[PDB]
Design a protein around this ligand. Structure first.
Ligand SMILES: Cc1ncc(C[n+]2csc(CCOP(=O)(O)OP(=O)(O)O)c2C)c(N)n1
Ligand SMILES: Cc1ncc(C[n+]2csc(CCOP(=O)(O)OP(=O)(O)O)c2C)c(N)n1
Ligand SMILES: [Ca+2]
Ligand SMILES: [Ca+2]
Ligand SMILES: [Mg+2]
Ligand SMILES: [Mg+2]
Lengths: 850, 850
């Protein structure tokens, strides 16, 4: 009889809660009272009860904790205690959880008498924190009025909440905390929670204010990651950083690393990023064993109201798809906020699960500190202007109780004002060798072309693949997969950790690498032969990710930030789906060092090639990456510097390469780690050269004394007699092979020279100038399997014309411009390719003008 | 006693349900049986019951329909009926709904007896549909084996499900259906549901198979929209199209327009787009009154296991945030699927709410028809190759029952086969005047600068704004807001519908337009002044959207497809966040007429300008838009055609404009509608020119006989004496004004000519040539307030050098290249701007070389 009523309250208590600070605007966007909650004695008929039952004593179930060292209670006691627990300033949304132990723990924490009481020292400390926050806010206001400082006015209880979280984490065992937070309230945290020299904060208020830099305090260590103004675009980055620190510190269960994130109410229910980030929480490869989310519900986004912003009651619904409990609290009552923070910290330290806490508050001023909010919401601010601040009412309550005397509070205010005034007055290298000796290469080749496990049986096709691998190894020949194994194993020997993530990377999207072997008979038997290469070596991890291209890339980037001695690779199924995560490339990878001055070295792998498989299963948009480079096309650098290659690579944002041969792909990954500094790397991997019969290289290019070749000159009869060569030809990728075959078909050998360019960013001016001067009489041309308005023409042409003294035109030999990456008609592809190949190996296509 | 048990089943039935077609892999990803379900007589102790209670008769509650014509069933009946209803081929997830009427309606359907029974005619029709689907699949397989087509084998009950849905919609009143669905099963729907000439389908299989294209059938009308391979990227487009059709057809409640969407299991739980699309559902401005989502749960994504893909149990947990009920069904049983589809159609026609139906099935072959799935999942396919197809077992069951005889079934197979081979054998203009007479302009100015409602009081600042508006109107002067009002009112007079949607558009992000007036004291009293202009006129709508930049743009794009007689505008808060919806610009607006034939005229508004607000609140990336143009920079078109302005505009893919004066903003908006055809328009609106004192124009540029000016020539003393002008200068946007000020500070009037370029795409190659020939001895230069690697230099320079016969170099006068859109230091901005003005206005920064 009573069990149904208690369940009904545990379901619908948060809907009738006075979480509203102003008293006017509602929190759940509905003022109706559902019939489940007994708002009056007339509603007992819904459960079949009546006014005669309000005095009969009822026995509590095993899922109720209001008894407090008491078994049965009069129904009036149950109703009063249940209203106090669920329908006052705290509303708990947790019964969507199917686990029983977590539900019982939450009930015990939030449904027992005499557990929320504080001590006088805690009240004094809370008063001190509230005074610090409020006086800092008014000092910023009165010393800087005509500014846009995004104030935290009408919600100062945030700072004590964060301090309570950090203190509970410290006493629970945590020794490292990583925090992410939007702009609203940044300076308060930077001055009170992550304590910093106030003179430095005042100095940085006037200059460098726009940039949200990184703040570190080192005795729990606190780090505040830099975040951009894009909303909710830094959660996966924080999760990746937390995972990397957990892995490096040896914490398998993450008992000493913690993650805290702050969100606004409007963005937590309007961005699809939160969905993707929440789905990464439980995946075995992306699980940081717990994050604490704090969402500030000021009940407004700029000038947009809550009812025209979302299709859900609360802005906290995304967290319920993963069974993460949610706590909504009224910011007016500070003790409730403190207890909720303590409960959330205990929950994270116990169950290693995400938890979200919602701070219901209001906004005292406009969106900016000089905006006019009466234009759009008159009633809201008319009601706002008739309410006391939280500090004033808290101080009055404490004075009435007798905890603090008025002179002490006044002295505290005066001394903190003097501290602020005093602070304000005071305020104003060579390229390594990447080769390997033959025994290491032979050992890796033999281990990779077999199965280490004794009774491990594989498929027949896989057996044929391994036999072909062994035949290649014994003949001193390497293909794409073998080159990948050799590079990764060589790095693993030196102690460098390697992580490879993305979609379908364990088997390969084209089924070419087979890095993970599966047993046909046993259900979960799995063998990774690479861990068996050497007795002592760095770990190796390969992971399959979800379909989100946005959260996984951010996670990988955050992981790459922790340590330089690590090789993190992200693989996309096709080069056309990277645009789903453009924001991550736009704000985090592109200007990571220009603003924020921190180093990263993530490797991005993008398959790219035109083979008729579709208008959008073809091409990786390299012209989008090539335009985001801090290089001036009109200036030719000094080509006679001490090194140039390493100096040029030092002054750039990232590197862009398009590898066609396995040897260069082997050397690039080694050069990524062996260098002193780190920079992001973008690689355009082929799609049809994996099985190509002549896409192979010998071991002689993998031996000691060999460096990565940024530009591969032409080898053949053309080089033997260079004065007779016409039509000097440049290419980048598979287009080389398609040319060479035709050069054999048309008997153009000795009349056309074809050269590749592996590295596009930065531009190799020196090597290109050296090889262009090799052929005095040859018409420069650029080949391309993409359209004119796509690919590398608009990037390469200015740089090629800069390399020479604009002494020669750079012609084009490729497809015509189009509004799509490729064509959807199979018949026209062959005609286009035949026309593309017509101009090459058929001279006088451009000499016809004269 | 029993109410708790029934409640527990209604919560946890779908977890123990036998939905798995394979007794092997699970769908909720957990094999454990929760203690709520009574799997054996020993578990009755959880509810306090025991084996002695299995025979006692228990009265049913008012929220349980098991019984039919019974009040009390003996407990052995309740348990059996509940297991049959919730734990046998059907799992219903709906109890998260808080509404009681919807819950009772759902319960009645699946929880009442003798409701799922069919008739012999229905069974015959189902057999016919299954035969058609299966024989078409095997015919495609045997006639085309070496193909990468995506096949529907494994789930062959999809076609009858869709046909049942459409039939129920037709009988419920729907007369128009819009459908979107991914590649898996496209041909089966195109050949069976949306019936099409099979010869045409066979012809398009060989050629033009790559592109999606649009399939129509007109007696319910069926439209299948084109969608790319990007997963979940076409739902908002479908919803926008549905909304537009509902609005033109006059269905306020949408009783005659319906929307159907199909999803895969892996993409419905891995993409954040679904989150935004689901929040767009209930929003009053974006409400399509229901949408029947169908998710096919084949339990595998390419080669990725469902456990390493998501954190939620089922891949349909994003629909529990909007209280949308979910039905999971086993595709083996066809009657259950048919009944579920009927129930979903009735639910949509009744409650006007979204509903999701999950068909649990398996995949018979690899991802493509020649993929090898034994490499990664051995046990799954080892079990798959030992199961009968659904058609075979259904035919055997019907033969045993006696509905159909074997000769009839064989004859049906033979006749459909013969139809298949028979089909296979058979298979093989001037620019308008946009001016207005003075009385219309005066009327719109008077109405817009005053309040229409008589008892309506506004703020004092708003009163001052309206007084300034009236002063401008009486003095024959127009600003940005007045120009917008005049354009919108002029279009509304002609009967053209106008819709403006996006973030903070009702008031304006800079509080300059005030299109919506709010009453200070009376609650919710709105007053749109432009809805009161003329006695008969088209409706006007302004909406505030959510923070999702991706879903709203897709919704607007879908809306601008239904009819040409409409002006749909999308406004962004800043030009930097548009990249969040890059995919929509990548696969839908860019190649929307090059790939599919449909035409679109959406207007995109992007604030753009460098003012020192930050590196992320400055610049709108115009160089990203300018590179996606199917224009060859190396060819100069024929400048002596009849038009060369309407012809040039006819070939392009969209238009890009940067408007500074309000008159051009008026004229371009009028020209967008008055043109015979439709093309997308991108406008770079200013931010600091809204309040600029000289950013104004007279009425003489809005009178009859005035056309939009693509290029504004240089007016002033320089034009009077053009032979004495040096440093011919090109600009685009606010920079002009700054330049003029500096010129006035340096007395360089008559020595520098500054010209704007309003239209960049199509490129004006005629007016620019004329004005370049106007000044013979003048060094061309380009002035931007953005970095050299960004902005318009890389686009404009090749086109400017093409316009002339490469006879004069195009210099640069702007900021130096950088890895970020702007700087984060306030001090360096002033130095950068001063250096920019210095190098712009001094006469030897380039001539010093000689
Ligand atoms: C992706 C994106 N992020 C940000 C903006 C601009 N912007 C900055 S703050 C803000 C309001 C966010 O609302 P809410 O989370 O409620 O913030 P609060 O009231 O706490 O400032 C918006 C829209 C934008 N247009 N697009
Ligand atoms: C955004 C994106 N879209 C598409 C792909 C490539 N792709 C095409 S179909 C497919 C499988 C989708 O899985 P599921 O939804 O289970 O569909 P099914 O295999 O049953 O068709 C993938 C990953 C990708 N990597 N990223
Ligand atoms: Ca309520
Ligand atoms: Ca289960
Ligand atoms: Mg807010
Ligand atoms: Mg699937």
């Amino acid at each position: 009889a009573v069990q149904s009523l208690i369940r009904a309250y545990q379901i619908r208590g948060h809907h009738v809660a006075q979480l509203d600070p102003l008293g006017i605007l509602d929190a759940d966007l509905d003022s109706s009272v559902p019939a489940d909650i007994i708002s009056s004695t007339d509603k007992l008929g819904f459960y079949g009860l009546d006014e005669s039952d309000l005095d009969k004593v009822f026995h509590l179930p095993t899922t109720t904790f209001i008894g407090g060292q008491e078994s049965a209670l009069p129904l009036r006691e149950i109703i009063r205690r249940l209203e106090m627990a669920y329908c006052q300033h705290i509303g708990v949304e947790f019964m969507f959880i199917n686990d029983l132990e977590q539900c019982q723990w939450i009930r015990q924490k939030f449904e027992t008498p005499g557990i929320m009481q504080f001590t006088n020292e805690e009240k004094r400390t809370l008063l001190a924190r509230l005074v610090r926050s409020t006086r800092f806010e008014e000092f910023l206001q009165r010393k800087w009025s005509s500014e846009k400082r995004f104030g935290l006015e009408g919600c100062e209880v945030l700072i004590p909440a964060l301090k309570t979280i950090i203190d509970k984490s410290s006493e629970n065992g945590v020794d490292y905390v990583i925090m992410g937070m939007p702009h609203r309230g940044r300076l308060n945290v930077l001055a009170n929670v992550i304590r910093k020299e106030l003179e430095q904060i005042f100095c940085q208020f006037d200059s460098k204010l726009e940039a949200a830099d990184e703040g570190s305090g080192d005795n729990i260590t606190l780090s505040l990651v830099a975040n951009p103004s894009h909303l909710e675009a830094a959660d996966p980055v924080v999760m990746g950083k937390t995972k990397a620190e957990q892995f490096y510190c040896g914490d398998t269960e993450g008992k000493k690393v913690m993650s805290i994130l702050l969100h606004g109410d409007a963005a937590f229910a309007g961005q699809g990023i939160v969905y993707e980030t929440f789905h990464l929480s439980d995946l075995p490869s992306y699980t940081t064993h717990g994050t604490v989310h704090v969402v500030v519900n000021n009940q407004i986004g700029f000038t947009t109201d809550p009812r025209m912003a979302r299709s859900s009651p609360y802005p906290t619904d995304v967290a319920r798809v993963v069974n993460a409990p949610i706590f909504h609290v009224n910011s007016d009552d500070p003790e409730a906020v403190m207890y909720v923070c303590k409960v959330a910290a205990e929950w994270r330290s116990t169950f290693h699960k995400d938890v979200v806490v919602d701070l219901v508050c209001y906004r005292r001023n406009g969106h900016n500190e000089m905006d006019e909010p009466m234009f759009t919401q008159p009633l809201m601010y008319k009601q706002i202007r008739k309410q006391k601040p939280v500090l004033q009412k808290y101080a009055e309550l404490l004075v009435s109780q007798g905890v603090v005397n008025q002179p002490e509070y006044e002295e505290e205010i005066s001394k903190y004002d003097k501290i602020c005034e005093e602070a304000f007055a005071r305020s104003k290298m060579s390229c390594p060798s990447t080769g390997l000796t033959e025994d290491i290469l032979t050992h890796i080749g033999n281990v990779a072309s077999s199965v280490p496990v004794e009774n491990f049986t594989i498929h027949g096709g896989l057996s044929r693949i391994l036999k072909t691998r062994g035949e290649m190894v014994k003949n001193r020949t390497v293909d794409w997969a073998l080159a990948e194994y050799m590079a990764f194993g060589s790095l693993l020997k030196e102690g460098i950790h390697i992580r490879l993530s993305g979609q379908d990377v364990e088997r390969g999207t084209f089924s070419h690498r087979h890095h993970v072997l599966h047993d046909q008979n046993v259900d979960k038997r799995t063998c990774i032969p690479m861990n068996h290469l050497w007795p002592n070596q760095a770990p190796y991890t390969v992971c399959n990710s979800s379909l989100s291209e946005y959260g996984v890339l951010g996670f990988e980037l955050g992981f790459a930030m922790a340590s330089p001695n690590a090789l993190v690779l992200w693989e996309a199924q096709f080069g056309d789906f990277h645009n789903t995560a453009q924001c991550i490339i736009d704000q985090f990878i592109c200007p990571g060092q220009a603003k924020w001055v921190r180093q990263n070295g993530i490797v991005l792998l993008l398959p790219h090639g035109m083979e008729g498989m579709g208008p959008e299963h073809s091409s990786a948009r390299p012209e989008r990456f090539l335009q985001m480079c801090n290089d001036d096309p009109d200036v030719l650098p000094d080509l006679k510097e001490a090194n140039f290659d390493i100096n040029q690579l030092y002054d750039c944002n990232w590197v862009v390469v398009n590898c066609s041969t396995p040897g260069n792909f082997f050397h690039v990954l080694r050069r990524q780690i062996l260098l002193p500094f780190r920079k992001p790397l973008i690689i355009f991997t082929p799609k049809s050269l994996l099985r190509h019969p002549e896409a192979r290289s010998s071991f002689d290019e993998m031996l000691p004394g060999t460096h990565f070749q940024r530009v591969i000159p032409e080898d053949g009869p053309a080089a033997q007699n260079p004065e007779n060569v016409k039509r000097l030809l440049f290419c980048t990728g598979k287009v080389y092979y398609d040319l060479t075959r035709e050069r054999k078909a048309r008997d153009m050998v000795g009349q056309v020279a074809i050269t590749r360019i592996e590295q596009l960013s930065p531009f190799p001016f020196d090597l290109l100038l050296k090889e262009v001067q090799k052929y005095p009489n040859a018409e420069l041309a650029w080949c391309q399997e993409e359209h004119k308005n796509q690919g590398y023409y608009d990037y390469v042409k200015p740089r090629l014309r800069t390399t020479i003294s604009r002494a020669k035109p750079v012609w084009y030999a490729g497809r015509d411009p189009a509004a799509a990456p490729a064509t959807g008609n199979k018949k026209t592809h062959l005609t286009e390719l035949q026309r593309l190949l017509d101009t090459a190996f058929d001279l006088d296509v451009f000499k016809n003008f004269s």
